[PDB]
Every structure is written in C-alpha cells, then in structure tokens.
Amino acid sequence: FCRLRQGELQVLGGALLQAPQPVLVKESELVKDTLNVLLGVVSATFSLCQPAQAFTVKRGVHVSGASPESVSSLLSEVAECGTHYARLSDFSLQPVLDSSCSKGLVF
Amino acid sequence: TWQQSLELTRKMLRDKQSKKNSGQRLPVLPAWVYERPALLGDFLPAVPIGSLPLASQEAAVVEDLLYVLVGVDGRYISAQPLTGRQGRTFLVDPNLDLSIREL
C-alpha cells in the first residue's frame, strides 16, 4: 500500500526517486547496518561518501510494511547519528593522529 | 635487503670493535641465528572472500591475524618482508567485507 502511494506520488512527479525507490532492506539487514554504524563505521546507508564524509544513505530503504519515505527518513536521522559517530571517532583520534602536533599537550 | 643491512651492520660493528679493542676478543654468535629467516620473530616476512560466509571469513581472518601478529603470515592478511629497516607489510585479501577488513 505505502509503496503504491509512493509510486503514485512518483508518477505524479515523474518517477523522481531513483535511489529513493525502496532499497529493499530486511529489518535484519537494517539492524546489521545499524550494528555497522554502531562502531561509528560507514555502512551502506551510512557510507562516508565523497560529499558526505560520513553516513550517506543507500537507495531509499523502505520499512516493514511501508514505502521508503518515512522509513529512510528515520534511517536518515539514525544516519546523521552514525555519520556524527564516524566523524567523531576520527576526531577522537586527534591526539594519536596529530603525533607531530605543534599545539602541545592540549590536543 | 634488511638481512644484508643487518649483516653489514654487524660486520661494521665488529670492524669498529676490532679497530678499538687492540686485539680484545669478542663473542661470535653462531651465524645460523642471523642466517635462519625461519628463526626471525617478526610477522612471517584463505577461502575466497567472495564465497565464504562473512562470519566464517571473519573467523578465518581472525586465525590469520593471530598467526601474523604471532609471527606467521595469515591466511587473508599477512605481514610480509621489510626492505631494510621497516615493519612487515600486511597484504589483506581484497574480497573481504569492507568494515570487517577495515577493522
């Protein structure tokens, strides 16, 4: 039903989803990708794309009995969280990473 | 190579010790220790990762890394010889899962 509603909206708008067309994501697959970003990693829907540096969504994951709009919207909120996690882990490596640091013991 | 450089360094140290010792004898280790690469302690210097299960491939890589960190080239990731003064260069199988291989 929701995929049909999304498809009707797409037909009205000219099939302007491409990626937002449901990325058929098993709730298990979504949980796995969540466990991926749980390490602050760049999952498939959390990939650190070139213009992302951090969580970048997959092809519009749908929900259990829904289209991708709200499913991937909540996924995108969680993706903002996991993108912050990936970047934050990189920032958490700032002391070790900046071994040749001209900033003293502060960093 | 690293072995050649180590041998040259030992020879140079021996030469300096002979030039400075005025005939003072120094211990000479059996060359088999430095001439036995199988006796080196560094990292030794896999199922198709697209076919094995990600968990099974991860377990095989875990055994591989236990071996490599214990001085034995692993199945998927193996740290290989160093050219001169360097660490053992780890070459990982490229078909593994992205995050798994990254970690």
Tab-separated table of C-alpha atoms in Angstrom:
chain	number	residue	atom	x	y	z
A	1	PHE	CA	0.000	0.000	0.000
A	2	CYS	CA	2.696	2.505	1.004
A	3	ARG	CA	4.870	1.547	-1.962
A	4	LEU	CA	1.812	2.155	-4.143
A	5	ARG	CA	1.298	5.558	-2.515
A	6	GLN	CA	4.964	6.391	-3.088
A	7	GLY	CA	4.646	5.164	-6.669
A	8	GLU	CA	1.559	7.312	-7.217
A	9	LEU	CA	3.454	10.312	-5.858
A	10	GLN	CA	6.371	9.374	-8.119
A	11	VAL	CA	4.101	9.038	-11.162
A	12	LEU	CA	2.675	12.478	-10.358
A	13	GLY	CA	6.214	13.876	-10.013
A	14	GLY	CA	7.834	11.948	-12.876
A	15	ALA	CA	9.466	8.989	-11.072
A	16	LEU	CA	11.814	11.385	-9.261
A	17	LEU	CA	13.144	8.946	-6.659
A	18	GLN	CA	15.632	6.694	-8.495
A	19	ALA	CA	17.562	5.876	-5.324
A	20	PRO	CA	14.547	6.675	-3.083
A	21	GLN	CA	12.816	3.762	-4.785
A	22	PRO	CA	12.668	1.267	-1.907
A	23	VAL	CA	16.065	-0.208	-1.138
A	24	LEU	CA	14.529	-3.495	-0.056
A	25	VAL	CA	16.005	-3.691	3.436
A	26	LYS	CA	15.223	-6.649	5.654
A	27	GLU	CA	14.689	-5.496	9.223
A	28	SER	CA	17.602	-7.855	9.871
A	29	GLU	CA	19.659	-6.077	7.198
A	30	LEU	CA	18.767	-2.692	8.712
A	31	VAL	CA	19.778	-3.952	12.151
A	32	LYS	CA	23.053	-5.219	10.683
A	33	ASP	CA	23.756	-1.828	9.106
A	34	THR	CA	22.896	-0.244	12.448
A	35	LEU	CA	25.434	-2.533	14.115
A	36	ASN	CA	27.883	-1.360	11.446
A	37	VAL	CA	27.387	2.301	12.308
A	38	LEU	CA	27.384	1.246	15.973
A	39	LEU	CA	31.159	1.267	15.616
A	40	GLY	CA	30.816	4.679	14.018
A	41	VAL	CA	31.553	2.916	10.732
A	42	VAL	CA	30.278	3.912	7.279
A	43	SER	CA	27.561	1.371	6.481
A	44	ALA	CA	25.985	1.014	3.031
A	45	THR	CA	23.318	3.518	4.039
A	46	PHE	CA	25.974	5.103	6.266
A	47	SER	CA	28.787	5.195	3.711
A	48	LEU	CA	31.253	8.077	4.097
A	49	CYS	CA	30.607	9.252	0.554
A	50	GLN	CA	32.719	11.895	-1.145
A	51	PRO	CA	30.199	14.658	-0.407
A	52	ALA	CA	29.314	13.030	2.920
A	53	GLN	CA	32.493	12.365	4.947
A	54	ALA	CA	30.089	10.245	6.947
A	55	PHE	CA	26.777	8.386	6.790
A	56	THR	CA	25.363	8.595	3.272
A	57	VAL	CA	22.074	6.815	2.658
A	58	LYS	CA	21.502	3.798	0.440
A	59	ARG	CA	18.828	3.611	-2.271
A	60	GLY	CA	15.953	4.655	-0.047
A	61	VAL	CA	15.414	1.766	2.368
A	62	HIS	CA	11.737	1.009	2.864
A	63	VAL	CA	10.226	-0.052	6.188
A	64	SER	CA	8.426	-3.195	7.318
A	65	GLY	CA	5.164	-2.568	5.507
A	66	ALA	CA	5.969	0.911	4.214
A	67	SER	CA	7.491	2.844	1.340
A	68	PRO	CA	10.950	4.410	1.697
A	69	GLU	CA	9.948	7.983	2.534
A	70	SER	CA	9.390	7.745	6.309
A	71	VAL	CA	11.465	4.558	6.591
A	72	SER	CA	14.582	6.128	5.114
A	73	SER	CA	13.708	9.400	6.881
A	74	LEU	CA	14.082	7.744	10.281
A	75	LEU	CA	17.032	5.902	8.764
A	76	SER	CA	18.434	9.307	7.791
A	77	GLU	CA	18.079	10.584	11.345
A	78	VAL	CA	19.928	7.485	12.529
A	79	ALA	CA	22.345	8.111	9.650
A	80	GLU	CA	23.016	11.608	10.934
A	81	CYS	CA	23.750	9.953	14.268
A	82	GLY	CA	26.078	7.378	12.687
A	83	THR	CA	27.731	9.989	10.483
A	84	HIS	CA	28.423	12.041	13.569
A	85	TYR	CA	29.757	8.823	15.098
A	86	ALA	CA	32.170	8.177	12.211
A	87	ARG	CA	33.423	11.754	12.160
A	88	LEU	CA	33.533	11.888	15.966
A	89	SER	CA	35.655	8.729	16.099
A	90	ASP	CA	38.023	10.409	13.654
A	91	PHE	CA	38.026	13.466	15.910
A	92	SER	CA	38.557	11.195	18.926
A	93	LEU	CA	41.733	10.085	17.201
A	94	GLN	CA	43.017	13.677	17.109
A	95	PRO	CA	45.649	13.150	19.857
A	96	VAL	CA	47.021	9.951	18.330
A	97	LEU	CA	46.542	11.220	14.774
A	98	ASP	CA	48.312	14.541	15.446
A	99	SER	CA	51.561	12.914	16.507
A	100	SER	CA	53.532	15.828	15.018
A	101	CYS	CA	51.347	18.422	16.723
A	102	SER	CA	52.535	21.999	17.263
A	103	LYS	CA	49.729	22.546	19.795
A	104	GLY	CA	51.231	20.995	22.930
A	105	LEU	CA	49.646	18.527	25.308
A	106	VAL	CA	46.253	20.223	24.826
A	107	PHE	CA	45.210	18.272	21.736
B	1	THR	CA	67.778	-6.120	1.906
B	2	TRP	CA	67.122	-5.993	5.643
B	3	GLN	CA	69.210	-9.134	6.160
B	4	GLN	CA	72.047	-7.658	4.098
B	5	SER	CA	71.898	-4.397	6.051
B	6	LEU	CA	71.864	-6.261	9.372
B	7	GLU	CA	74.861	-8.347	8.303
B	8	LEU	CA	76.668	-5.198	7.164
B	9	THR	CA	75.884	-3.502	10.478
B	10	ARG	CA	77.156	-6.488	12.458
B	11	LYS	CA	80.306	-6.578	10.321
B	12	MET	CA	80.852	-2.829	10.741
B	13	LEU	CA	80.345	-3.106	14.498
B	14	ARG	CA	82.821	-5.994	14.571
B	15	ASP	CA	85.283	-3.956	12.496
B	16	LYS	CA	84.987	-0.983	14.847
B	17	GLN	CA	85.355	-3.242	17.883
B	18	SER	CA	88.468	-4.813	16.348
B	19	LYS	CA	89.976	-1.433	15.472
B	20	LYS	CA	89.283	-0.168	19.007
B	21	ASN	CA	89.930	-3.340	21.044
B	22	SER	CA	93.650	-3.719	20.252
B	23	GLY	CA	93.058	-7.442	19.834
B	24	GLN	CA	90.370	-7.814	22.501
B	25	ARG	CA	88.288	-10.849	21.568
B	26	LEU	CA	84.511	-10.541	21.396
B	27	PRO	CA	81.797	-13.209	21.429
B	28	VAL	CA	80.878	-14.551	17.998
B	29	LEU	CA	77.312	-15.811	17.825
B	30	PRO	CA	76.512	-18.803	15.612
B	31	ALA	CA	75.675	-17.269	12.262
B	32	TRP	CA	72.767	-19.724	11.911
B	33	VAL	CA	70.722	-17.456	14.217
B	34	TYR	CA	71.069	-14.473	11.880
B	35	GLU	CA	71.098	-16.731	8.791
B	36	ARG	CA	67.829	-18.515	9.670
B	37	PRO	CA	64.904	-16.433	8.370
B	38	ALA	CA	62.637	-19.115	9.800
B	39	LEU	CA	64.202	-18.102	13.137
B	40	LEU	CA	63.139	-14.456	12.746
B	41	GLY	CA	60.495	-13.305	15.209
B	42	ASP	CA	58.656	-10.741	13.087
B	43	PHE	CA	55.462	-11.460	11.182
B	44	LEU	CA	56.294	-14.007	8.531
B	45	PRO	CA	58.452	-11.742	6.266
B	46	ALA	CA	42.207	-18.189	2.635
B	47	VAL	CA	38.816	-19.265	1.300
B	48	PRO	CA	37.546	-16.991	-1.500
B	49	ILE	CA	36.429	-13.951	0.455
B	50	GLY	CA	33.594	-13.515	-2.010
B	51	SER	CA	32.488	-17.124	-1.384
B	52	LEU	CA	32.967	-17.807	2.336
B	53	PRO	CA	30.356	-16.534	4.810
B	54	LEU	CA	31.201	-13.133	6.231
B	55	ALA	CA	31.321	-14.664	9.714
B	56	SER	CA	33.291	-17.702	8.522
B	57	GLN	CA	35.615	-15.460	6.513
B	58	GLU	CA	35.995	-13.269	9.602
B	59	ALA	CA	36.898	-16.309	11.717
B	60	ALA	CA	39.480	-17.446	9.166
B	61	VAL	CA	40.923	-13.923	9.098
B	62	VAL	CA	40.959	-13.909	12.917
B	63	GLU	CA	43.091	-17.053	12.934
B	64	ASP	CA	45.200	-15.474	10.187
B	65	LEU	CA	45.776	-12.333	12.265
B	66	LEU	CA	46.570	-14.348	15.382
B	67	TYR	CA	49.236	-16.096	13.316
B	68	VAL	CA	50.533	-12.902	11.713
B	69	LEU	CA	50.709	-10.989	14.996
B	70	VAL	CA	52.399	-14.113	16.402
B	71	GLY	CA	54.918	-14.154	13.557
B	72	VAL	CA	53.191	-16.362	10.964
B	73	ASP	CA	51.743	-14.922	7.748
B	74	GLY	CA	47.977	-15.155	7.980
B	75	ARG	CA	45.503	-16.610	5.508
B	76	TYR	CA	43.833	-13.345	4.491
B	77	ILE	CA	46.084	-10.630	5.955
B	78	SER	CA	49.791	-11.461	6.068
B	79	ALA	CA	52.653	-9.159	7.030
B	80	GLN	CA	55.465	-9.716	4.517
B	81	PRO	CA	59.207	-8.959	4.437
B	82	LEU	CA	60.539	-5.468	5.096
B	83	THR	CA	63.095	-3.940	2.710
B	84	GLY	CA	65.748	-2.784	5.156
B	85	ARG	CA	64.661	-1.217	8.439
B	86	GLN	CA	60.879	-1.476	8.279
B	87	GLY	CA	57.880	-3.370	9.553
B	88	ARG	CA	56.275	-6.388	7.973
B	89	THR	CA	53.926	-5.169	5.246
B	90	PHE	CA	50.408	-6.542	5.673
B	91	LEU	CA	48.613	-7.580	2.490
B	92	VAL	CA	44.956	-8.445	3.068
B	93	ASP	CA	42.654	-10.378	0.776
B	94	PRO	CA	40.596	-7.840	-1.224
B	95	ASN	CA	37.282	-9.747	-1.392
B	96	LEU	CA	36.541	-9.463	2.340
B	97	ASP	CA	33.728	-7.406	3.820
B	98	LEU	CA	34.549	-3.702	3.823
B	99	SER	CA	34.112	-2.954	7.525
B	100	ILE	CA	35.490	-6.351	8.570
B	101	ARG	CA	38.694	-5.872	6.574
B	102	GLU	CA	38.949	-2.249	7.732
B	103	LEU	CA	38.755	-3.204	11.410
